[PDB]
Design a protein around this ligand. Structure first.
Ligand code: HEM
Length: 214
């Protein structure tokens, strides 16, 4: 399609399904998530978003990323810090896992931000528009599965408080994505990088399910 936002959506349909089909996500969707499994995905997300948000800050004034720079609206590191303090306690930094599959994803995010920053939009699309677009169904599942106390914390990640309307915001973000100027080669690489981002998530899911089933 002409618009990058539509090109991305169409090009990643089949890997999104692969993610939906991954065993860990099948189980999450059938509501068979455990607190230990949930904790692991929240730890994963912290590492991913620390790396992604570091590289967005690095490249925020670059013409290859500035049009989609929305820090107040989208930043997730602080929310995940709040959440991990709940799930892993006050010493969470010293005890959260940082696994090889998590490292693989973080490594690629830094390579992209430092040496192929034109591709960073692919990673911000995959994470932010996915977490925003899917956050509604994704949260629903946990709360009814995790039996959390009524302690007012642990799921801040699933609320973007500086977005009053997700629908308006997605429209805006897509608009901005579409205003990026790129050659056909870069556009091709951006699309492939969005597929790569999905596969990095899928391989993570495969690792976490392994870790949880000993
Ligand atoms: C069990 C797994 C998953 C479920 C149930 C699912 C849920 C959703 C929902 C409900 C939407 C709405 C579609 C729309 O935009 O109209 C969607 C969008 C999307 N999700 Fe997921 N998702 C899952 C896995 C993931 C993963 C692992 C990623 C990436 C890390 C992801 C990235 C995306 C993206 C980028 C979109 C937005 C598409 C676009 O508008 O271009 N999803 N997903």
């Amino acid at each position: 399609p002409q618009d990058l936002s539509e090109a991305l959506k169409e090009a990643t349909k089949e890997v999104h399904t692969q993610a939906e089909n991954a065993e860990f996500m099948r189980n999450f969707q059938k509501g068979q998530v455990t607190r230990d499994g949930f904790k692991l995905v929240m730890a994963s997300l912290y590492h991913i978003y620390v790396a992604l948000e570091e590289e967005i800050e690095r490249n925020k004034e670059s013409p290859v990323f500035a049009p989609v720079y929305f820090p107040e609206e989208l930043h997730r590191k602080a929310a995940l810090e709040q959440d991990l303090a709940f799930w892993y306690g006050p010493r969470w930094q010293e005890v959260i896992p940082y696994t090889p599959a998590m490292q693989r994803y973080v490594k690629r995010l830094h390579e992209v931000g430092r040496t192929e920053p034109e591709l960073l939009v692919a990673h911000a699309y995959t994470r932010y528009l996915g977490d925003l677009s899917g956050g509604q169904v994704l949260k629903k599942i946990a709360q009814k599965a995790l039996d959390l106390p009524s302690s007012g914390e642990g799921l801040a990640f699933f609320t973007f408080p500086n977005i009053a309307s997700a629908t308006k915001f997605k429209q805006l973000y897509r608009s901005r994505m579409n205003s990026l100027e790129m050659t056909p080669a870069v556009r091709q690489r951006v699309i492939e990088e969005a597929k790569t981002a999905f596969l990095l998530n899928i391989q993570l899911f495969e690792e976490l399910q392994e870790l949880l089933t000993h």
